[PDB]
Write a protein that binds this ligand. Structure first.
Ligand SMILES: Nc1ncnc2c1ncn2[C@@H]1O[C@H](COP(=O)(O)OP(=O)(O)OP(=O)(O)O)[C@@H](O)[C@H]1O
Length: 278
């Protein structure tokens, strides 16, 4: 933790890379080194810095430094130039259970590590899952330090690290069909479906998906936090540890469902479709 006289003495603030609820992420140059970073600027509505600065993991975005101004906190992060999770899936032509499995393994591995350090996302979502670079074989990254929230947290019951495993469960669902497992225009009923963990592998969107992927999802999207798979157990499941994930081209359907259920995606495919032509 440092205290900048004027942070712009240290960093050249450029483009807004993304936007949060209470934050915005900005592309900046470290003027001292010429290296490119992402800076999360958080408005003012240590113990955290200590553990957060100790985070060293391939599939987690590094917290390089922290500066504090009059009314802001500036988190100097590893720059990632790959884009969000669903954006890439929608923009690329071939998608399989295998690609989904290879993505979940990484998320599990990263989250497991975070739980060993005592960190608990609790708000892990696809917007927090970014590709490291633009290449096809690029790894996924957790950036951060509406259905994704575990039933117990919404029940205001006591909860633990297991809430992240539920969140990972939900992402795996969308990664295989393209739409959230809990959907309703009325917010009140939506929270009831989540609290009851009531969901199905409805046809025909779930016709080509293997049984092992379903069983896997069932064990993470478990209402009981004590029956729910840990990161370790899910990492030991055949769908992640074995060879049960299929190589069926399930892209078109998953992609269209994402474009339908997520506003950003429909024209992210369009921008990229036009930008690549040149
Ligand atoms: N290290 C990074 N490199 C490049 N882009 C990033 C980086 N971190 C975040 N972004 C972009 O900025 C967005 C904001 O990230 P965050 O602000 O961490 O996500 P969020 O969905 O807004 O979660 P929250 O509302 O809790 O802040 C990301 O979705 C992504 O588009």
């Amino acid at each position: 933790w440092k205290q900048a006289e004027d942070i712009r003495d240290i960093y050249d603030f450029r483009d807004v890379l993304g936007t949060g609820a209470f934050s915005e992420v900005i592309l900046a140059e470290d003027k001292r080194t010429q290296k490119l970073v992402a800076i999360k600027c958080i408005a003012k509505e240590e113990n955290e810095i200590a553990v957060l600065h100790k985070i060293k993991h391939p599939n987690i975005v590094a917290l390089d430094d922290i500066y504090e101004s009059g009314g802001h906190l500036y988190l100097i992060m590893q720059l990632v130039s790959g884009g969000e999770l669903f954006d890439r899936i929608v923009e690329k032509g071939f998608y399989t259970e295998r690609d989904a499995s290879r993505l979940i393994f990484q998320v599990l591995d990263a989250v497991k590590y975070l739980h060993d350090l005592g960190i608990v996302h609790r708000d892990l979502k696809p917007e927090n899952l970014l590709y490291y670079s633009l290449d096809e074989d690029s790894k996924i990254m957790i950036s951060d330090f509406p259905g994704y929230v575990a039933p117990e947290v919404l029940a205001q019951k006591p909860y633990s690290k297991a809430v992240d495993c539920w969140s990972i469960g939900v992402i795996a669902y969308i990664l295989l069909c393209g739409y959230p497992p809990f959907y309703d225009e009325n917010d009140a009923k939506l929270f009831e479906q989540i609290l009851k963990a009531e969901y199905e592998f409805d046809s025909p969107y779930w016709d080509d998906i293997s049984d092992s992927a379903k069983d896997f999802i069932r064990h993470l999207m478990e209402k009981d936090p004590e029956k729910r798979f840990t990161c370790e157990q899910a990492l030991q499941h055949p769908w992640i540890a074995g060879d049960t994930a299929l190589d069926k081209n399930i892209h078109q359907s998953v992609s269209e469902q994402i474009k339908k259920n997520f506003a950003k995606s429909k024209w992210k495919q369009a921008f990229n479709a036009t930008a690549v032509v040149r």
